[PDB]
Design a protein around this ligand. Structure first.
Ligand SMILES: CCCCCCCCCCCCO[C@@H]1O[C@H](CO)[C@@H](O[C@H]2O[C@H](CO)[C@@H](O)[C@H](O)[C@H]2O)[C@H](O)[C@H]1O
Ligand SMILES: CCCCCCCCCCCCO[C@@H]1O[C@H](CO)[C@@H](O[C@H]2O[C@H](CO)[C@@H](O)[C@H](O)[C@H]2O)[C@H](O)[C@H]1O
Ligand SMILES: Cc1cc2nc3c(=O)[nH]c(=O)nc-3n(C[C@H](O)[C@H](O)[C@H](O)COP(=O)(O)O)c2cc1C
Ligand SMILES: Cc1cc2nc3c(=O)[nH]c(=O)nc-3n(C[C@H](O)[C@H](O)[C@H](O)COP(=O)(O)O)c2cc1C
Ligand SMILES: Cc1cc2nc3c(=O)[nH]c(=O)nc-3n(C[C@H](O)[C@H](O)[C@H](O)COP(=O)(O)O)c2cc1C
Ligand SMILES: Cc1cc2nc3c(=O)[nH]c(=O)nc-3n(C[C@H](O)[C@H](O)[C@H](O)COP(=O)(O)O)c2cc1C
Ligand code: NA
Ligand code: NA
Lengths: 373, 373, 373, 373
């Protein structure tokens, strides 16, 4: 284990995964100015430590939507985790659970709402795309009836982002074979062996006797995307769903406030990890405004790789941070154990950062610890 | 092939064109800080999407100078397109009309005012350089009588810009042969064959028994450039031309306002794609100001390569964007089909961008969708 | 040789030291954005020279904590200098005294408090880490009774910084052998020979019959670090120590002011040379503010390599600058002579800088000689 | 002649000159952040052209210190031009004269005050270092008696800058032979042949039967530098010199104003081409302030390579721009003809720039043509 940070796991993923799958994981939209901006924006703050503060007893635990967890991270929703590691959705969820944090299941998961709730008893969240009311109500109810605590509505994939790595690779659900496909698979024998042994992953929440192939399932899922979803549909969802409701994919304090007005319990500021709109702002640019404007839980993702990144968001008011690629690196490098190791480092990293800035209780973070640069 | 954006066609044009011709198309003035700045300035804005907006039915069509077109782009005027592809002016013109947008013919075209109007029935514009009243009145009249709808006066080539790529290549109108020339032509057989079969392109609006070679046509054209053209000459032109009149090459709101005061119907903010003055501002720096100061159509060019670039200019108030090199890459790679394809990508790209930022009708764009950085 | 500045000695140290030891000396925390920022920040000021000032007689001497020295530098505290050169602590100490400046011995030195005082008669300072009162009182007392004039309390190593060079190299106190270790030692025969002849360096202030190996000494030292050290413990130390007391590792004027309030004689602004917290501010960002807020001696370190760096800190109000790596490069390249030489270059460099900016007496420096940029 | 700008001549110099001489010409002080800043600062302004202005008749001529010249450039003072080209001082002066502009002779020239006035009838300036009154009065009077019109006092070389290229090369007046010297001379046969044919250049203003070698002359010149020269000595000089007096090497409006108060007719803002103090401001940073503060001629140098650079200084108020390296490139590349060609380009370049920004009369330049960026 010569692995000391998230980036060491990224490097390991790139060796195990075929170029085509790594490009699906790593790529962003168009020129990828956005993913770069998602990282660079964190250099806009530096730390002003408070010295001679007793930090001998540190606590990372905190309340997210009124419920205590061991640190303010979550494993956020990502589709097709089964391309990365067998039963990857369950790997992630078990690691989140051992680490004391929630896991968010994707509409596009390779393991169904119900199979995951049957095999793991952590705090499971479900994320729903913007889709047409009928089959949406079908998923929401399966999540209700199996004990999912909070529902996430992702609003930033009405239409698909223009990801040119996937276009250059021809990475699309009807795959077939190719000079490049076979070659890519052959130079990555560990993954290909895993792939033959276990088979093509399925869009498990679209499976049935009648839609029994991936090509069939994806076609159904894209037919269900609803680019007309508006504030009215959100009220419909608020009324259908009795527990915690969050709106994901927002990039303004104004939309954040409107979501709360229509009944949301909180929001997730996000640009989908730079995968949807290359020239979108980072959510860090509207965090403090959205926190000040709403007074309700503001969570955030997009670009987080280091404990200092996370700490900066928490000091500006964020209730918690969702990990996408960071823990996905652990998954495809080393499976469920990889995810455990990444969360173990990030916890140690957050904990070390709190020590060095003189703030022993994570809930007492504030901009006072930041220099604006 | 793998052609998914404008840059992929640049790569393709660079392979087909001989180095000297590629350098005439691509180059800018002196150090080329200006062409660089023309691209970089677009990073001064990022997008704040509005979510939970119905974007299932999008419209790109808009009024330019009171006339509806399918999207707010134009193929702007560029000279010597016949160096890029046989009958290059008509190719560009036929593609613009299929796509539903105007095409602007250059004073320096390889096909004459009249011959283009006899071969294309789109919305044709004519651009006139600052030149001496006599032969200017001649071209203006040919254009009026052949049904051109709009006249644009280009005001930024009083003197020739200092383009050091052409100087180092010895790319000048008395060409002759050389070790390098022949070598360049021989390494580009598709283009050289096209050139041998079809001959030396000619300045078609300067052809006559007396100026029967390209050298004589260019000698005449540069002797006709009139660095004294002032506000008086503009009024003279305004009285001579009864239809829509635009002034191109402005880089201040004050000059824009004066152009409107002297009867112009609108302006084109431009620095000639960085080809005339390396240290000129980008026209994006004075776009919002010119829109507020004149209240008349403000169009713009210089630097546009991505749909996101175009959308940012439209949200700051521009009526439309003219393309120079972007559609010239398609022309020089694959002719009229290449041009079609580039316009097809840019229309889809603009449309996708509108979807992602939550603005379904292009006419409702505003700075509200922008963050200034 | 061709040794004309500090960087030339870095190049020389890098050739003699094995890669693992060079990485312990050179490395910083995590991404090393901090060490980079420590250098770059000096570019935020440029010089406005005053001309037609008589600068024929220049003086570098100045009062630090009321005591005259030949120039306003100190060799600050660094641990494990014996890894760089035999008797490295004494070499540094003997060179400082020849140059007329204090030397600060580290808690983590390879030569004991008492043995250094028996072998050098300069102005010796002792730096104490934040540790448990019992053995702290022991070292403080050894230093008082052996004639140390100043005590500095380093407050920024509650927890160890995350230095990934050492982790990737497996550079840890239970070392052992390896393919890479032996290879590294064999490619650096001068250093390896020195190491074989002289043995494993020891934490000399933690030596006893029971902690008779380096592993045991380091085990003891890290168990003695006291993350609870607070303002109360500082008063305790203030009463225990009768002479000059400084607090090192501060990064705010507010903490500086509190340190003065609790009896300290001055402070050292520091981020431990970027080794503890990658995203910490440079202390130059809070230098002028700390000087104005306390009105007491404000010293500084972190990033200094050029005489111009030093002069800029002095014009903003700093009483003196401590050197870490700069004089360690001289030590590891050429021992006590290397250290002498580096101090000789830096004194000449400071003196030349004063000549060029028209300020003949170092004590009259002021921001008036600076432009903020 | 494939030479279209100053940089093409720099490239040519580097091939003809031995590395050691090129490094003396090109190098700056220490890290050479200063020369880089001297270039980069010009990117802080861009141009806002005025359109539809009659620029058919352009004039470059202007008054410098009340005397008309053909363009507001000067060839400024540089020592050891005879290392670059035989009788280089006379080459430069003849080119300045054919181009209609003054030439400034250096104290450190390879041709004496009197020999140059005997062989060229242009507008000759003399620059004097800060030196001890006696031999200074000897040079000032020779310049007076031979018709030099203006005297320049250079105040920024009290002590020598720390130029590490010269230190690495051992480029010092007692040269001798060496592995590197002979090798350098052998790989540059054109220059070495020139050097044997004509001999070691001499500090011609320090020549006599008694100080008849370069080693003797340089020793005398460095003994005469007077780091005590102050405002009193300046008044002495003002009284000794009856014609125009300028003070060179200033970097503040305050010193500029003081020079005028003590009788100077104007100042030259300069940092000696980045050769004296790496971290000095560019003089462009205090140009507009010095122009506004004094109301007397403010000239400038340091960093000028392009006509746009020059134009920007003139629009901020500068009376004229002195060239150092720019015309020295022409000299060592191609002798007197090289200097002619460089000035011909720069005139064409200034003239083209005025056309493109719509300002036909150079005296009507103003900040109105600039955008601050
Ligand atoms: C405009 C909208 C377009 C829709 C965009 C949809 C993009 C989604 C990408 C679909 C990829 C389907 O995910 C599927 O995963 C399987 C197993 O995990 C992998 O399987 C495939 O890739 C590997 C690459 O070496 C090959 O060895 C294998 O033979 C091939 O079938 C691919 O990853 C893909 O077949
Ligand atoms: C601290 C202050 C130090 C004082 C600084 C003084 C630096 C000044 C540099 C002095 C160089 C004297 O300039 C003199 O020029 C002659 C002819 O032009 C050149 O002559 C020399 O260089 C060339 C290099 O190839 C050799 O071939 C030749 O044999 C050698 O003598 C050198 O340039 C130098 O000898
Ligand atoms: C491969 C991949 C698949 C994703 N799938 C989904 C998804 O199915 N549903 C969703 O709401 N967000 C999805 N996301 C977005 C993440 O939830 C999250 O917003 C993003 O990854 C955070 O950016 P980061 O990767 O830099 O941490 C996906 C992200 C990636 C990288
Ligand atoms: C090869 C080339 C030729 C051009 N010729 C003309 C021209 O003849 N008349 C004109 O008004 N503008 C001309 N232009 C400028 C363009 O009309 C347009 O202003 C510029 O290309 C826009 O910048 P862009 O290439 O970055 O899109 C030319 C540009 C290029 C690159
Ligand atoms: C190898 C090394 C060891 C150090 N050891 C100590 C130490 O033991 N105690 C301490 O207070 N500071 C220690 N420091 C920090 C230095 O005292 C000083 O604050 C820092 O080196 C200044 O930055 P600079 O290297 O850029 O000059 C150490 C620094 C280095 C590089
Ligand atoms: C090789 C060289 C020698 C110089 N010698 C002198 C000199 O003897 N006296 C003087 O006043 N300035 C001298 N200068 C400074 C120039 O006069 C001028 O200030 C500087 O070169 C302008 O910067 P630039 O080279 O970027 O144009 C010298 C500059 C160079 C590069
Ligand atoms: Na299910
Ligand atoms: Na003389």
């Amino acid at each position: 284990q010569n692995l000391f940070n998230v980036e060491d796991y990224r490097k390991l993923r790139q060796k195990r995964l075929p170029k085509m799958v790594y490009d699906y994981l790593e790529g962003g939209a168009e020129d990828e100015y956005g993913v770069k901006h998602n990282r660079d924006v964190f250099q806009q703050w530096r730390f002003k430590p408070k010295r001679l503060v007793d930090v001998s007893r540190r606590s990372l635990q905190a309340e997210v939507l009124g419920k205590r967890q061991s640190m303010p991270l979550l494993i956020g929703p990502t589709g097709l985790n089964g391309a990365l590691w067998p039963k990857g959705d369950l790997a992630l969820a078990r690691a989140a659970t051992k680490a004391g944090i929630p896991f968010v299941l994707s509409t596009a998961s390779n393991m169904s709402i119900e199979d995951l709730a049957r095999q793991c008893d952590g705090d499971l969240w479900f994320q729903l795309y913007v889709i047409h009311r009928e089959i949406a109500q079908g998923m929401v109810l399966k999540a209700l009836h199996t004990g999912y605590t909070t529902l996430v509505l992702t609003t930033d994939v009405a239409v698909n982002g223009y990801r040119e790595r996937d276009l250059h690779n021809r990475f699309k659900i009807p795959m077939s074979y190719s000079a490049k496909v076979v070659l890519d698979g052959c130079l990555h024998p560990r993954w290909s062996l895993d792939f033959v042994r276990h088979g093509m992953p399925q869009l498990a929440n679209f499976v049935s006797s009648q839609t029994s192939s991936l090509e069939m399932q994806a076609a159904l899922m894209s037919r269900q995307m609803d680019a007309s979803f508006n504030w009215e549909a959100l009220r419909w969802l608020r009324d259908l769903w009795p527990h915690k409701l969050l709106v994901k994919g927002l990039l303004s304090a104004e939309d954040a406030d409107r979501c709360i007005a229509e009944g949301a319990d909180g929001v997730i500021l996000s640009n989908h990890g730079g995968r949807q709109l290359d020239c979108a702002i980072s959510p860090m640019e509207v965090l403090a405004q959205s926190v000040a404007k709403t007074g309700k839980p503001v969570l955030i993702d997009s670009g987080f790789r280091r404990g200092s990144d996370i700490v900066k968001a928490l000091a500006l008011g964020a209730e918690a941070v969702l990990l996408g690629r960071a823990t996905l690196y652990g998954l495809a490098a080393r499976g469920e154990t990889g995810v455990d190791e990444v969360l173990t480092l990030l916890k140690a990293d957050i904990d070390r950062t709190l020590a060095q800035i003189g703030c022993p209780d994570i809930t007492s973070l504030s901009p006072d610890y930041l220099q604006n640069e």
